[PDB]
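Hi again,

Forgot to attach this to my earlier email, sorry! This is the prediction with calcium ion bound. I've pasted everything inline since the attachment limit keeps bouncing my files.
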Amino acid sequence: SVKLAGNSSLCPVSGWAIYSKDNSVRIGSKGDVFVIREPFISCSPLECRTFFLTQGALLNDKHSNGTIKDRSPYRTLMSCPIGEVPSPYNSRFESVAWSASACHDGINWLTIGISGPDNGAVAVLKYNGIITDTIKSWRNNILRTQESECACVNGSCFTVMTDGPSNGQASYKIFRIEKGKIVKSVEMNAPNYHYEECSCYPDSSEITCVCRDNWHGSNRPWVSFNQNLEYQIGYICSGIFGDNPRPNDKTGSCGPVSSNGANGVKGFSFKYGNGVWIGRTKSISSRNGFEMIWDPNGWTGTDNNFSIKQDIVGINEWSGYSGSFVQHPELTGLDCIRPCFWVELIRGRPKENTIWTSGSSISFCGVNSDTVGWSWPDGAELPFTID
Amino acid sequence: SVKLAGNSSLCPVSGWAIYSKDNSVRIGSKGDVFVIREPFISCSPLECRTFFLTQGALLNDKHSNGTIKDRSPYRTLMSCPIGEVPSPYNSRFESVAWSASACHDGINWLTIGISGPDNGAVAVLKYNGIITDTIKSWRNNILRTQESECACVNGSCFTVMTDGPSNGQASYKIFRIEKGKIVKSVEMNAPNYHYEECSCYPDSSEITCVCRDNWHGSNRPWVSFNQNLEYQIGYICSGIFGDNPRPNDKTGSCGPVSSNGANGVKGFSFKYGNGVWIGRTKSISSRNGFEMIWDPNGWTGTDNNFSIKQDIVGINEWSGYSGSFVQHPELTGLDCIRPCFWVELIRGRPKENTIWTSGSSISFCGVNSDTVGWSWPDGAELPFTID
Amino acid sequence: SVKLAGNSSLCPVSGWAIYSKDNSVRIGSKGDVFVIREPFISCSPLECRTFFLTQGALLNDKHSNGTIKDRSPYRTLMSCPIGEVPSPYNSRFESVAWSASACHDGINWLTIGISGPDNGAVAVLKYNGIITDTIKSWRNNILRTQESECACVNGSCFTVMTDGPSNGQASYKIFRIEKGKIVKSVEMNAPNYHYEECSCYPDSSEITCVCRDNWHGSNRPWVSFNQNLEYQIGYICSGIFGDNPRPNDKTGSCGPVSSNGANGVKGFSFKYGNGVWIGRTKSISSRNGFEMIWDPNGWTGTDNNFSIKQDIVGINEWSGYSGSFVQHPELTGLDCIRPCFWVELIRGRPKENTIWTSGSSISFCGVNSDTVGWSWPDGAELPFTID
Amino acid sequence: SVKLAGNSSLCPVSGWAIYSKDNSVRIGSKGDVFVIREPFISCSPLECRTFFLTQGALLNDKHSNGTIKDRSPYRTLMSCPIGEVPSPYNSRFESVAWSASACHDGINWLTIGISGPDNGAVAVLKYNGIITDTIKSWRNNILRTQESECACVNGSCFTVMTDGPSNGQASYKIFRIEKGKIVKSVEMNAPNYHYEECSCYPDSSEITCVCRDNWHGSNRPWVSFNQNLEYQIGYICSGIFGDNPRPNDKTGSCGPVSSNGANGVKGFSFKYGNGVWIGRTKSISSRNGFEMIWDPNGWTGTDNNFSIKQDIVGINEWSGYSGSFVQHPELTGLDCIRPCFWVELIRGRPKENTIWTSGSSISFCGVNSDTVGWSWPDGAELPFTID
Ligand SMILES: *[C@@H]1O[C@H](CO)[C@@H](O[C@@H]2O[C@H](CO)[C@@H](O[C@H]3O[C@H](CO)[C@@H](O)[C@H](O[C@H]4O[C@H](CO)[C@@H](O)[C@H](O)[C@@H]4O)[C@@H]3O)[C@H](O)[C@H]2NC(C)=O)[C@H](O)[C@H]1NC(C)=O
Ligand SMILES: *[C@@H]1O[C@H](CO)[C@@H](O[C@@H]2O[C@H](CO)[C@@H](O[C@H]3O[C@H](CO)[C@@H](O)[C@H](O[C@H]4O[C@H](CO)[C@@H](O)[C@H](O)[C@@H]4O)[C@@H]3O)[C@H](O)[C@H]2NC(C)=O)[C@H](O)[C@H]1NC(C)=O
Ligand SMILES: *[C@@H]1O[C@H](CO)[C@@H](O)[C@H](O)[C@H]1NC(C)=O
Ligand SMILES: *[C@@H]1O[C@H](CO)[C@@H](O)[C@H](O)[C@H]1NC(C)=O
Ligand SMILES: *[C@@H]1O[C@H](CO)[C@@H](O)[C@H](O)[C@H]1NC(C)=O
Ligand SMILES: *[C@@H]1O[C@H](CO)[C@@H](O)[C@H](O)[C@H]1NC(C)=O
Ligand SMILES: *[C@@H]1O[C@H](CO)[C@@H](O)[C@H](O)[C@H]1NC(C)=O
Ligand SMILES: *[C@@H]1O[C@H](CO)[C@@H](O)[C@H](O)[C@H]1NC(C)=O
Ligand SMILES: [Ca+2]
Ligand SMILES: [Ca+2]
Ligand SMILES: [Ca+2]
Ligand SMILES: [Ca+2]
Ligand SMILES: [Ca+2]
Ligand SMILES: [Ca+2]
Ligand SMILES: [Ca+2]
Ligand SMILES: [Ca+2]
Ligand SMILES: [Ca+2]
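Structure tokens for the complex follow:
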């Protein structure tokens, strides 16, 4: 067992090849499948796993009632092999949590699970399944984290947490964690910025995070930092707006785009110099469809021109949260860090006439060989027997 | 593989961080989940497992009928990974038993399973799944044991068993077991004492047990002993009474507190010099709620003042049995033995209008970082389809 | 990995301690549990497994209809950890078979599965899951084997097969198998004898088999042989008749006891010098109850006196097939071969008003410490929803 | 771990011994079993696995509706241990695919999964679960592959793919793959030939494929090639026609037999010099029954005489696709490559009045010891509760 280096560059990619699909909701119609949301993928030097937040209930059972609710003492972080349905019979317990993150440093798994009351939530950190540290809410207003994988470089793993209003200025902190122990943290000095549900990845020994501004931006904010937590902040400049909801594409801004800026969805983007791979919904108003767009100067340029678009989910099909995950050379045998992403396909409330809300997942990995756009939707027929 | 040393002290702790929650009853509404009671946790140098006594039946099935009954030829000891639901598809068979204990000596698992008739029950000892010894009832009146983990020190494991009345003077024996073989035992000379369902843990090469007086004590009896079984006995002196039922907190006694002393519930406490961490229900009369209380002189002092209280389960929510379990430095990498505990959340009879009785579980581990009180209840909606 | 020696003696035992109980039928009421019969246990140097013949159907499903039938192209030999319910989710596939045997030589598993038509059945031998040999019916009349574990000594495993009438003189052969290859066989010269469903075990480098005479004996026939297949034959002389049905106990015979000799049930017995441990039903007419009897001169003596009786299943409770299995010193660390046994508890047809027939199991191991008699019945409530 | 040599000859065999049967459809009546088609078996140096294409739905659930359809974004390649039912609880996710192949090179698994639109499908190659390459449709007309195992020789694995019409001249390419990377390919110059769903196996360092002519041949086309992809092509000459549908047996041809040549079914054959082992349906017009036929000069001779016939599935029972798979000496310890085969037993549409279509499987391995013909059918009772 050797810790991940994290010192190579991101693999440049021309397209995205489909990696997994679990068909969770379709199967859950009869099978014993957890009601879940906020799934995310993370890899070790040996395997890739799907993490998810359960509602402590199964699909098509009465206890799935009212699962549109985000937080409760019943939610737990669990994981299963990628591509498999999240079931009590194949899932590993990770932590009690209504907000979470996880990642592998090359030696062991780190998991971060937040639970407790809105006014004093506590993040429990585990390393190899053993509690190693905790961190308590410092603003007493819903301590919350990535809902995707943390990023690891040379034995240290990094994450971002938010505490405060989701409709105004909040507080954002970056953490450096070693063997499950917080060794350093810093509060981001970011007035007029808003950070939630960051998707973070390593690249050339440094961390880049693309996040969600729930306050007043329809473009996505970002934060990057080295291992010493020396950071920079900004917003993606592209007129190809990445959040949902958002305005129709037009001239962008290197600051928060106020038009349709309230609300949002977890997302991600991959930075390559001044360019950016943007993953976003197809609809500007609802969580429908998904597409990958290559914009060669979109990180710093404000125009709405782009070079490549690849369809992932049709515009008439349900999508939801999305996030980045990487495969390290230690796993692939490549000489660079390979970018991948996952998409949550949300079914149920509030858009459909059910008593429940749950999601299935698809994932893709970046390649330089031939690829194709299509639609890989959830495919479940609602409502269910329970409703 | 190396045997656990068990020679370090208990880690001092300031609070308790949530470690697991299985949501068993909620999931069992649809899923294939055992009807269980008396769950308990025990760890090896590699992993932690939940042990439990099944009724040889699944939730929401007709065979769950009359499972309020404690003893039958159908009950078996089984185990599964911590935090997972006890299902026939993920559970390991341990022993046929209606009373049980288990612990890992660093090399292999020891399980103790008692079955047979009330007037001649036999405890079957297994080491690495192989029968290694038996011990038969010596008072012919329901031979019974911990219903939680035994305690191991330097290759020897220790447990306590009781035989005789549950409403009067009985007989209590301590056992030393090596590789599943009883190498020594001694009967405790404890007139006017009553010991049942002991929660035992190792601390500085010696064993401490906190138990249940079902005869005439609303405070908890304790027994401690070295590897040679040289023992001491007493009662927790704190006016913060630990049993259920019990009187309102007042001046305590270093002997059995007779007020509300009959009946009781399995519980635990952690000794730290003259101080004590007490886990107990919130209700004085019923198995509802749960809390952890730090009383700096409560082991030997009779006053009812305490320093710390942490909420675990709300007073309006069902609780039940609770017990200690520890994580050895061989597992954690710490330089002390870490205290943890589990709580059984009992649903169904006799308090609820169902045909069945079963429990789910939560567990916590002691830390010195920030923690928070809350309520992590079972959360199931009764009655069920079967009733 | 080292092959089992099989050169030590059987462990003398004073009683039987309960080892496992699966509660298969109770759980199968709701859970996904195979309809099975002819379960048997067999051990490796590492673990013990339950083998069984499925009907290719689950309990409480329509395909369990008519499962009173013994042979079909749908029956398969499968195995699961001892004490666990036989489910498609925890069971390993072994072979297609309506008659079977299996055993571990210390290195790998040998399985023998017979399938095909009544007039030309073929036994398929597998070693480590790879087909290594076959043997075809030589009398064209239902080739059939032990339905319990084969016996292994120093890298060779031994079994017995029958071909011919089940109500008259048939043909019986002993086989020596090495790494799944038949290296020697011999036909037993046994006129007026009848051998079916032999329970065989190793003892001091030789094999002893106690079997079922379905033709004209209410006592059990036996055959013993060395590694070169030099054999001896006889019948258990004890007036404590072991088969079912049978007459009331009286003066026995060293030949087949004709009274109530037709029909029968698979069983076993352990030989100790002139003495014998006899396992049998409690009823003389039906497959009900079970008991272990120590008869110090019952192997060669014809009286009906005995020294020890231990209750296993109550007379009013269903029992069925039973068989021996052993635990080698390589597994236990003992200096002798430990005798164990299993009992099949048959529910359904023809005794009960269902459409199906299936069994659960219990098992016990021989010890010299204290034990107790009791009743550990199936405990399922019939009929089921499917009927 | 060492790569498979693949340099020995095929083991000559006189008959076929039954190896596995999963009873999938029977069990799926109640159990949680995938709706599947196109199952196939492939082995490593350690184990044999069943691969299959799911419809992302379970039997007896509403989502099984319209599963007669071959292609969709919901279909995935998964695998489970041979002989076990394909369940979400025991199946490993491999790839998103509506056409697939897989094989083990001695070190890791190679999987090939094709998904995407009919006019631009993309094959995703994975080595040890990691995407290693892609290949895109070159004729824009349903890129498709074996639906059985690829063949490996000395670290290189080989497969065949087709692009173009299924009712006329198409394009056929052979691929050489090393560690999941395409290192060479060549288009077959085969005017008037049609290749689909090839069954390929290694033999003396070279690859032989027997395939399906869906255009105008009732006999099967073949292609063989060395590691450098230098190939030869032809048709099986035997008047014992191997496809379905087909004419009654008569004089054959070394070219495509036009009579009943349109349409077909995936199948296989084993070449032995001028002789051939032919597996085929019993019905000439429908997918019913299955038999193995040894024709000593059937590879190059056009007569309709044969030497051996062995019944596998009765003519009145449903069959379906069939394919070859081999066990290498690295797995068996033999000095030759052992031939095995599997048969898909298709139930439901279009031949039966259900809303769904699915298959179970049986498999056999070649031996030189005694064997027997019989019928090992699916055995499910249709329709189901869902219909
Ligand atoms: C998921 O949650 C949904 C929201 O709760 C459930 O729907 C609700 O179902 C309840 C129970 O039937 C229903 O309850 C009330 O309102 C009734 C009129 O609409 C009223 O008649 C009920 O009260 C009367 O009866 C009760 C019981 O006897 C008495 O205690 C009262 O005093 C009175 O006599 C009761 O107030 C809701 O109307 C309904 N809500 C909605 C929005 O439909 C789903 O049932 C649940 N699904 C599952 C599968 O569990
Ligand atoms: C387990 O197997 C049991 C034995 O088969 C089943 O019980 C049987 O159920 C069948 C179907 O209902 C039933 O069938 C026949 O007999 C009827 C009179 O008893 C007769 O009316 C039926 O025939 C008529 O209808 C059919 C269909 O429309 C026509 O084809 C006929 O021409 C005629 O009009 C039919 O002959 C058996 O009576 C019954 N047997 C017994 C012993 O009860 C169970 O149903 C089965 N259980 C499960 C769960 O599958
Ligand atoms: C990346 O890290 C590895 C492991 O420490 C190191 O050997 C290598 O030199 C680094 N790569 C570069 C380009 O510096
Ligand atoms: C405890 O045992 C350890 C491990 O063998 C030993 O090294 C150490 O000396 C002991 N500690 C104490 C306090 O005696
Ligand atoms: C539950 O079991 C008891 C005891 O046998 C029985 O009296 C009662 O009728 C059962 N209840 C139901 C609802 O079946
Ligand atoms: C039994 O077999 C073992 C292993 O071959 C051998 O070492 C030993 O001598 C044998 N025991 C006796 C009593 O001969
Ligand atoms: C096949 O390869 C093996 C294994 O490396 C080699 O030893 C042997 O020489 C080869 N056999 C033939 C027939 O060439
Ligand atoms: C099955 O699916 C088809 C296609 O959507 C639909 O037309 C049909 O109504 C469905 N059948 C049933 C019984 O639901
Ligand atoms: Ca079910
Ligand atoms: Ca926004
Ligand atoms: Ca641009
Ligand atoms: Ca009390
Ligand atoms: Ca005090
Ligand atoms: Ca008889
Ligand atoms: Ca006698
Ligand atoms: Ca054809
Ligand atoms: Ca010929």
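Chain C touches chain A through one residue (CB under 8 Å). The first strand of chain C starts at residue 15 and ends at 21.

That should be everything now.

G.
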